[PDB]
Amino acid sequence: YEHVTVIPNTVGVPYKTLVNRPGYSPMVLEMELLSVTLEPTLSLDYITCEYKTVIPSPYVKCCGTAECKDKNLPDYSCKVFTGVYPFMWGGAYCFCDAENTQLSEAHVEKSESCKTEFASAYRAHTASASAKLRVLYQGNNITVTAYANGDHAVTVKDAKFIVGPMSSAWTPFDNKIVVYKGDVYNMDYPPFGAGRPGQFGDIQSRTPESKDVYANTQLVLQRPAAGTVHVPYSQAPSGFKYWLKERGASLQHTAPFGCQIATNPVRAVNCAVGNMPISIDIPEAAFTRVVDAPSLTDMSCEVPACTHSSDFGGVAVIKYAASKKGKCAVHSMTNAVTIREAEIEVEGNSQLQISFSTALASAEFRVQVCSTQVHCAAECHPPKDHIVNYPASHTTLGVQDISATAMSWVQKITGGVGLVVAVAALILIVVLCVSFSRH
Amino acid sequence: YEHVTVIPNTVGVPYKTLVNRPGYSPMVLEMELLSVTLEPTLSLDYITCEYKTVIPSPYVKCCGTAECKDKNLPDYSCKVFTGVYPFMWGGAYCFCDAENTQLSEAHVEKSESCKTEFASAYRAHTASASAKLRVLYQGNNITVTAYANGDHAVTVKDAKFIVGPMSSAWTPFDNKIVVYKGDVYNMDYPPFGAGRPGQFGDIQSRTPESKDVYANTQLVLQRPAAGTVHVPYSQAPSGFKYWLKERGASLQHTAPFGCQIATNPVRAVNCAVGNMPISIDIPEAAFTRVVDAPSLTDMSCEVPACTHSSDFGGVAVIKYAASKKGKCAVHSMTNAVTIREAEIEVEGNSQLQISFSTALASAEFRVQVCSTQVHCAAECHPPKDHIVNYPASHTTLGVQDISATAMSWVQKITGGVGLVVAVAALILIVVLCVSFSRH
């Protein structure tokens, strides 16, 4: 028997689906999503990290002008400074006090630390959805793991499950993301080979191990002074270190729908978006014939107490004549009231007790037990706790088409006004009938 | 100077662009795509290959009934047959006949051959398009390799090139593809865990090395021939072998737009779809001032021959007076005529020869030789050959462009009819003016 149902894409909340196969006792399956994951497919664009500036010992040519040639190093710079008269600990270094020049050169390369401390610029395309589903099949708690793309059917206890496709293709991740450690950011990182100084991406490489490094640090060599032998320079500070200080909140804290973000690999977890279709193939052996099942008679419902609040604030007690001893499923006949128990055992002429959750001020519902039904009704009190740390178990909130009891006031006013109109209309019609009877 | 152009994605066809930077001599660049690759990102769903049926020696109970035990092997089947009296080469298997029964069992495993002979079922997402561009820059042929997503900067000869984004996101690959050796197919392969016997994907595993194997071969054990111990069975033939025989044409033979398909990695090459924006950052050192360039005066164009053969069969000769020896860039002032030469060397008082390709019946066009322009005209002949082995170098012409100078027939006829209308209109106007002058 193929049964198809749809549940909201929420986590930690059970849903009930009724399986009606004629000739067999009704079956109720309790389904709960334990985890939902959207895993994006990523392609690495580049790695950015802290740069290292390399400055070889300066060359001093005492008598004559020093010269250098262009090099192909990532951000190479070279300059010759004239009129220098450098000193060492033992006194002046250079004999000539004229035509004395210093040759300074420097280049930029990726730091060795880039193998450990770096940010990865990734491109996101599409995501593969998957989920862990708990199903109360045959009274047992069975965990079903499958992809949520309408594929990868899995079989547990001879029951085949197909999950998805998802009703929504929304993801918390943008096309461009940056991953540092456990933190993922929706950052529009600059194009490879065209980074800017003092900003994220000032130094770039395709992979951590690559020797191909782009660098733009605006490294400028400065003149030495006061007889010193140093090689001063002006260079923009690493944009990586600046970014780390100014990262701001990551998607783990800013993403909508309560999405959790994880890395290694990158995942979006338990996003409350859209819904998830589920198709279950149920073996014929899983069904009990109505002739073998218990059949209840002379049933009646009472409701000792009710609070219209979360976590099943209502309680109902139903008296039944068991007839044959056995067990059967219990299901609500309305979406306004949800019953916690999926099934009960019936014996003798005892009463059954079930709990329920509703947003209704007046709980008006029917309960189906062992293929027969009773009518339950109660006035439900409000909660005292304004706020709770768990999601509501009831289906929805009150709507214009749903109201409390003792609302006969609305009917009485509507009826009274409608009567006044009906009478006024009749009086005018009768007078007109007379008017048209003239001549 | 940043120069932005758009060229067609047709590979092997050069396009020229004019760089107009006021104060400097006009520069002409030639660009040709050598290769365009659309490389899809793939995610493996499953591997399918030939299955191996495993049948262990049967068990014969000489005087009694054997029983089967359940097993969790991928397609396990077991049956016990009665009334069997098997023989060996040396005589009957046992003394007892009527109570003699046989137990046969079998299961299915993926073949060890699946390591080298298998088809991979992939899902495709997006393509990381890239291109290899040939550029004529400063008189030299340079090669630029870059991604075509618009986010990759490549600098050559101090000139920065940006390629893309692509004007089209079309790919020859569908969302679901199957790859065997060098052959990629677009097929809706069956979902994992739910294959069908005798069809592709009858036996599946997530990876070639996986021990988790799904199989649906509909293996049924049959009763052995009397007097024998063999184990007969009915099983669907491998769907992999059937698929190999019925594969049909591969995408490299069926794909639109002349796409070439290759595997390892899977990619589409040189698809003639849409166009590709290119942005070039040209350094000031690359430019020559108008005062540095030769000035060309008193020049005229003569066209000794023209055929619209699409092979640059047209020839034009331009007589010029140059102020000094040097080089000038040459560019067509119309899209109907393309000139093969990007630049010409000019000296003293002489003439230069260039070749061109057009589809015009009458080659009326202007040519910019340096800082000045000359007008060319010719009557062009058709080619003798019907078919060529290369794409046309000329562009597509509209209705107003294909017309010859013989179109003066249209003007004479249209003018004649227009004159008749103008006169008839005048006659009516004059009569109406008189008509209201006498009433």
TrEMBL record, chains A, B:
Stated role: Provides the signal sequence for the translocation of the precursor of protein E3/E2 to the host endoplasmic reticulum. Furin-cleaved E3 remains associated with spike glycoprotein E1 and mediates pH protection of the latter during the transport via the secretory pathway. After virion release from the host cell, the assembly protein E3 is gradually released in the extracellular space.
Segments traversing the membrane: 413-436
Domain of life: Viruses
Compartment(s): Host Golgi apparatus, Host trans-Golgi network; Host cell membrane; Host cytoplasm; Host endoplasmic reticulum
Main location: host cell
Protein's UniProt keywords contain Phosphoprotein: no
UniProt record, GO biological process: entry receptor-mediated virion attachment to host cell; fusion of virus membrane with host endosome membrane; monoatomic ion transmembrane transport; proteolysis; symbiont entry into host cell
Positions of disulphide bridges: C49-C114, C62-C94, C63-C96, C68-C78, C259-C271, C301-C376, C306-C380, C328-C370
Record keywords, A-Z: Capsid protein, Cleavage on pair of basic residues, Disulfide bond, Fusion of virus membrane with host endosomal membrane, Fusion of virus membrane with host membrane, Glycoprotein, Host cell membrane, Host cytoplasm, Host endoplasmic reticulum, Host Golgi apparatus, Host membrane, Host nucleus, Host-virus interaction, Hydrolase, Ion channel, Ion transport, Lipoprotein, Membrane, Palmitate, Protease, RNA-binding, Serine protease, T=4 icosahedral capsid protein, Transmembrane, Transmembrane helix, Transport, Viral attachment to host cell, Viral attachment to host entry receptor, Viral ion channel, Viral penetration into host cytoplasm, Virion, Virus entry into host cell
Protein name as it appears in the record: Structural polyprotein
GO cellular component: host cell endoplasmic reticulum; host cell Golgi apparatus; host cell nucleus; host cell plasma membrane; T=4 icosahedral viral capsid; virion membrane
Organism from which the protein derives: Chikungunya virus (CHIKV)
Location of this fragment in the whole protein: 810 to 1248 of 1248
Subunit structure comment from the entry: Homodimer. Homomultimer. Interacts with host karyopherin KPNA4; this interaction allows the nuclear import of the viral capsid protein. Interacts with spike glycoprotein E2. Interacts with host IRAK1; the interaction leads to inhibition of IRAK1-dependent signaling.
GO terms for MF: channel activity; RNA binding; serine-type endopeptidase activity; structural molecule activity
